[PDB]
Amino acid sequence: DFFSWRRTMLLRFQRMETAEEVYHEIELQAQQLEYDYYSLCVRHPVPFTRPKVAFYTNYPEAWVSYYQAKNFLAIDPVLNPENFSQGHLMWNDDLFNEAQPLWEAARAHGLRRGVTQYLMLPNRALGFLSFSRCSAREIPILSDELQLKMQLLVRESLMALMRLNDEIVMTPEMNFSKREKEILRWTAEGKTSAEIAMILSISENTVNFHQKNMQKKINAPNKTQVACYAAATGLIHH
Amino acid sequence: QDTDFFSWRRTMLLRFQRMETAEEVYHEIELQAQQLEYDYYSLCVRHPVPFTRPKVAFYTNYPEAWVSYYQAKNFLAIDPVLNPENFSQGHLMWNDDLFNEAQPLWEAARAHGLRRGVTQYLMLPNRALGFLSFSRCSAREIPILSDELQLKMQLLVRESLMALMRLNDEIVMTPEMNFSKREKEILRWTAEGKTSAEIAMILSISENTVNFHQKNMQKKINAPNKTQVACYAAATGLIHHHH
Numbered sequence: 001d002f003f004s005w006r007r008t009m010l011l012r013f014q015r016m017e018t019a020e021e022v023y024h025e026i027e028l029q030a031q032q033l034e035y036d037y038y039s040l041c042v043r044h045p046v047p048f049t050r051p052k053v054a055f056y057t058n059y060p061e062a063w064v065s066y067y068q069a070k071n072f073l074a075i076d077p078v079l080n081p082e083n084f085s086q087g088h089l090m091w092n093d094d095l096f097n098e099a100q101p102l103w104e105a106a107r108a109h110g111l112r113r114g115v116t117q118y119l120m121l122p123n124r125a126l127g128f129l130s131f132s133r134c135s136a137r138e139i140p141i142l143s144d145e146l147q148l149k150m151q152l153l154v155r156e157s158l159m160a161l162m163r164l165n166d167e168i169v170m171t172p173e174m175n176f177s178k179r180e181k182e183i184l185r186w187t188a189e190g191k192t193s194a195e196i197a198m199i200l201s202i203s204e205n206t207v208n209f210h211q212k213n214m215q216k217k218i219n220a221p222n223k224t225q226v227a228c229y230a231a232a233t234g235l236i237h238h
Numbered sequence: 239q240d241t242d243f244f245s246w247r248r249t250m251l252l253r254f255q256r257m258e259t260a261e262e263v264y265h266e267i268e269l270q271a272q273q274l275e276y277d278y279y280s281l282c283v284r285h286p287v288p289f290t291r292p293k294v295a296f297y298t299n300y301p302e303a304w305v306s307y308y309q310a311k312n313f314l315a316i317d318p319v320l321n322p323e324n325f326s327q328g329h330l331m332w333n334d335d336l337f338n339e340a341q342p343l344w345e346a347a348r349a350h351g352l353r354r355g356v357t358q359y360l361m362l363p364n365r366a367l368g369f370l371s372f373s374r375c376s377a378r379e380i381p382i383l384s385d386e387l388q389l390k391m392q393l394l395v396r397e398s399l400m401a402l403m404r405l406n407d408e409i410v411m412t413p414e415m416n417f418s419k420r421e422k423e424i425l426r427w428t429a430e431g432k433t434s435a436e437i438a439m440i441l442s443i444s445e446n447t448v449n450f451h452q453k454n455m456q457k458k459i460n461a462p463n464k465t466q467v468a469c470y471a472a473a474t475g476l477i478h479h480h481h
């Protein structure tokens with residue numbers, strides 16, 4: 001009877017044409033599980049020093065504004081894979097021992113209990129789904145059925161959002177030609193422009209143009225950043 | 239039965255996290271494969287590096303005649319079972335249509351006694367792609383509705399490969415890069431395209447030492463450039479989590 005839930009959810013997400021349908025479905029499923037608020041967050045693998053983070057939530061506008069103002073993304077333990085197990089995490093008082101200011105601000109805004117699930121996407125982006133409620137001592141649930149239900153919800157929603165090329169999950173656009181990616185693969189092996197020229201039987205002049213043309217559309221200083229970003233997102237071995 | 243599945247997981251999770259040798263993992267897969275009415279299992283892993291001809295390691299109890307034949311005819315290069323594009327929810331059932339591109343492979347598999355099979359796959363924290371395939375000789379049918387099998391296989395792919403990662407098994411492990419936290423920090427900056435001179439200013443150290451760590455970093459990995467080291471680290475996710 002649970003397996004039929006999995007199958008319907010699988011049928012639902014595969015037939016979605018809109019992002020609003022994805023976020024709405026998450027809203028419903030969260031509510032079926034006695035949770036009021038959902039939040040879907042994605043941390044991209046690049047840039048390496050300040051990884052891009054996009055999110056979408058039905059949290060109260062006041063809490064979102066407060067959260068961003070205090071820069072809580074940078075210290076939220078819910079977004080730290082270390083604190084997870086089997087990609088699952090139940091919110092508790094101890095988890096926020098390092099970030100109490102977050103916890104108190106969240107409680108002051110009406111977030112008593114919550115839970116988070118996470119996975120890694122094909123572009124190596126880290127997706128986080130969080131559910132939260134304002135009510136204590138209600139709890140629905142088996143955890144096992146909870147872990148497994150949420151496990152599916154992160155996957156199929158974010159994968160759906162990728163089919164639709166949504167801005168929240170799609171990495172900074174890097175539409176390269178098959179020629180450009182060949183040069184990237186060899187650059188990533190530590191080949192010089194001269195060696196890549198001989199290997200591909202083209203002039204070093206043509207190699208450097210391609211090299212510069214990729215740096216153009218990404219706005220990057222050298223061939224080193226372009227290659228590492230490509231390696232980091234899996235554009236090379238997808 | 240829904241309930242006795244969750245407990246199956248909890249034990250299997252307990253099993254795999256506390257296995258101490260690689261043979262124990264392959265052993266567990268073998269029984270479950272048999273418990274699931276399959277004679278032959280195959281666990282295959284595609285590494286993310288090298289970028290130009292990535293290494294592929296495997297372990298199976300296939301008839302060796304087919305193994306020798308499979309490699310000899312070089313079927314990996316055209317095997318749809320190892321192509322993530324053909325999957326859905328990380329799962330894939332074998333049928334005559336999927337092998338529309340590989341006529342030599344399917345009938346040859348039929349000829350060696352692989353009538354029916356199924357494959358599950360997922361991506362590991364080191365960005366390696368793991369594939370688990372089951373196969374049987376009995377020809378007949380589609381088993382049990384396709385939900386518990388997918389889910390059983392979903393777990394079996396994960397925990398076996400994760401167990402093998404904990405054990406530093408060669409089938410899953412990427413080239414090890416035990417760097418100092420400082421050495422990894424300059425790589426993050428190298429991957430952002432900072433010159434040794436630029437990295438010096440931001441970290442308050444002499445340029446003599448920046449060039450020093452990089453060459454010292456190139457030592458332990460066997461590679462020429464500041465570029466290849468950064469790309470291998472970037473490719474494996476060494477540069478920002480999970481390991």
Ligand SMILES: CCCCCC(=O)CC(=O)N[C@H]1CCOC1=O
Pocket residue numbers: 039040041055057059063064067068076078079102106111128129130
């Ligand atoms: C305000 C939305 C940005 C945060 C996105 C996210 O997923 C992280 C998260 O929910 N954290 C929870 C934990 C306490 O505060 C929250 O809202």
Ligand SMILES: CCCCCC(=O)CC(=O)N[C@H]1CCOC1=O
Pocket residue numbers: 280282296298305308309317319320343347352369371372
């Ligand atoms: C030598 C074996 C390498 C690994 C084989 C593999 O990709 C997994 C697998 O079961 N493939 C199936 C597909 C058809 O023939 C097979 O053997």
